[PDB]
Amino acid sequence: MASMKKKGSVVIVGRINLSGDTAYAQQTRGEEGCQETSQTGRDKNQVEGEVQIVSTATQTFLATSINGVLWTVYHGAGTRTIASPKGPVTQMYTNVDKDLVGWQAPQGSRSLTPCTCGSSDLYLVTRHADVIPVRRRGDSRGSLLSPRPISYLKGSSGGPLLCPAGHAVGIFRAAVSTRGVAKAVAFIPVESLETTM
Ligand SMILES: COc1ccc2nc(O[C@@H]3C[C@H]4C(=O)N[C@]5(C(=O)NS(=O)(=O)C6(C)CC6)C[C@H]5/C=C\CCCCC[C@H](NC(=O)OC(C)(C)C)C(=O)N4C3)c(C(F)(F)F)nc2c1
Numbered sequence: 001m002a003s004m005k006k007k008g009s010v011v012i013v014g015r016i017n018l019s020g021d022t023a024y025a026q027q028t029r030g031e032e033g034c035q036e037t038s039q040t041g042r043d044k045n046q047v048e049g050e051v052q053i054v055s056t057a058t059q060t061f062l063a064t065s066i067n068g069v070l071w072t073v074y075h076g077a078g079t080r081t082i083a084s085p086k087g088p089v090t091q092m093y094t095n096v097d098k099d100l101v102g103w104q105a106p107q108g109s110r111s112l113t114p115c116t117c118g119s120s121d122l123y124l125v126t127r128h129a130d131v132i133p134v135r136r137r138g139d140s141r142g143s144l145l146s147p148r149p150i151s152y153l154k155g156s157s158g159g160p161l162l163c164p165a166g167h168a169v170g171i172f173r174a175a176v177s178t179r180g181v182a183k184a185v186a187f188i189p190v191e192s193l194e195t196t197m
């Protein structure tokens, strides 16, 4: 028992900048500092924006602030704490059935508003800051207007699908792949997050 290890914290390592006319990824922490911050859980970096790039020791993905909660996928974060200036922060929501977790949104983040538009013309934001049009096809599915190899979507779970007005419609969960080409995506609808809240 004496040598039983602790899994580290999720760490914010960058963000997707949507504040201007041009979407772009920004790295805010390199690999070595990420490893150190995962073990201590103490991240003194200033957080900005709605979409964070996050990492564990073994995986990197996205997390999205909606109504004061930073949300991501359970298949990325598990039950992990997130690093913050005051130390590790415990999840406030965990739902494996939805592939969903959330923590209180970091000080300095900005939150998206849940969409009430009832629109089916959506936009997926990836970890490379690509803004991909997606037609909504059901409660939890949308089609890519321009299909792409799954390589282009890998690492973007936890990112948002947005409506034309920039509201949050859902959280990207899984790619529907045929022969390595993503023609559609599965997402956690924001209504599911609102109920969890
Ligand atoms: C115990 O609790 C659990 C444990 C494990 C779970 N594993 C789950 O699925 C896994 C992970 C998820 C994935 O790869 N996600 C993305 C990503 O980027 N992840 S990632 O950031 O790289 C990351 C791995 C986090 C670092 C957006 C994808 C981008 C590219 C696709 C790559 C090819 C994979 C295609 C596959 N497609 C699929 O399964 O499609 C159907 C329709 C569902 C069958 C798919 O997408 N995935 C398979 C799910 C889910 F299914 F709910 F998602 N729940 C879980 C609950």
Ligand SMILES: [Zn+2]
Pocket (backbone or CB within 6 Å): 114, 115, 116, 117, 118, 119, 163, 164, 165, 166, 167
């Ligand atoms: Zn909307």
